[PDB]
Design a protein around this ligand. Structure first.
Ligand SMILES: [Zn+2]
Ligand SMILES: [Zn+2]
Ligand SMILES: [Zn+2]
Length: 162
C-alpha cells in the first residue's frame, strides 16, 4: 500500500516561498505546500488545490521536478510524493489556518527548522536538477537510510485513478 501526495515549491530567482505549519503534525517546521491527493482528483489538481488553500496563490504552470518515496518503521504505508515547482504565481500570499507563507532568500534556507530530508533534495531543486529519492524514516527526526539520484526527465507513474 502507498499513499499519494504532492509537494509544491514556489521558487523565484532570488527567493523561495515556504510555509510554517501552524498546527497539526509537524507544527513549527517550514516546508513546501501540498498534501494528500484525494479520491476523485488528479495529482496536478490536488497540487493546485493545496497551494491555493495553504497560501492563497494560483499558478499558471507547475513543473514536475521530482519523485520522493518515504518509508517509515512500523507503518506498512509508503508515501509516493510528487514534487513540483513553479515560478509563475498570482495573488498575494496569505496564511490559512494550517500554514503561513513567508519568503526566504535562497542562501538563507532554514534547513535546521525543516524536515531532515530537505537538506538532501533541496540542493538539487535549487540547481534545477530533476531527481528520484527514497528516505527510510524512524520517527519524525531520523533518516535511517536514503537514496537520491538526478535524472534527465521525470518518471511518469500513470496513476489511472488520479
Ligand atoms: Zn486513489
Ligand atoms: Zn520550477
Ligand atoms: Zn506516483
Amino acid at each position: 500500500a502507498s499513499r499519494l501526495y504532492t509537494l509544491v515549491l514556489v521558487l523565484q530567482p532570488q527567493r523561495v516561498l515556504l510555509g510554517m505549519k501552524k498546527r497539526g503534525f509537524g507544527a513549527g517546521r517550514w516546508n513546501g505546500f501540498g498534501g494528500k491527493v484525494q479520491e476523485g482528483e488528479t495529482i496536478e489538481d490536488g497540487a493546485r488545490r493545496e497551494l491555493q488553500e495553504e497560501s492563497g496563490l494560483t499558478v499558471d504552470a507547475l513543473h514536475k521536478v521530482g519523485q520522493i518515496v518515504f518509508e517509515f518503521v512500523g507503518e506498512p504505508e509508503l508515501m509516493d510524493v510528487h514534487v513540483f515547482c513553479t515560478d509563475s504565481i498570482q495573488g498575494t500570499p496569505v496564511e490559512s489556518d494550517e500554514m503561513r507563507p513567508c519568503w526566504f532568500q535562497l542562501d538563507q534556507i532554514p534547513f535546521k527548522d525543516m524536515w531532515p530530508d530537505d537538506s538532501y533534495w533541496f540542493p538539487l531543486l535549487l540547481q534545477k536538477k530533476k531527481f528520484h529519492g527514497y528516505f527510510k524514516f524512524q520517527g519524525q527526526d531520523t533518516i535511517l537510510d536514503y537514496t537520491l539520484r538526478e535524472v534527465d526527465t521525470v518518471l511518469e507513474h500513470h496513476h489511472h485513478h488520479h
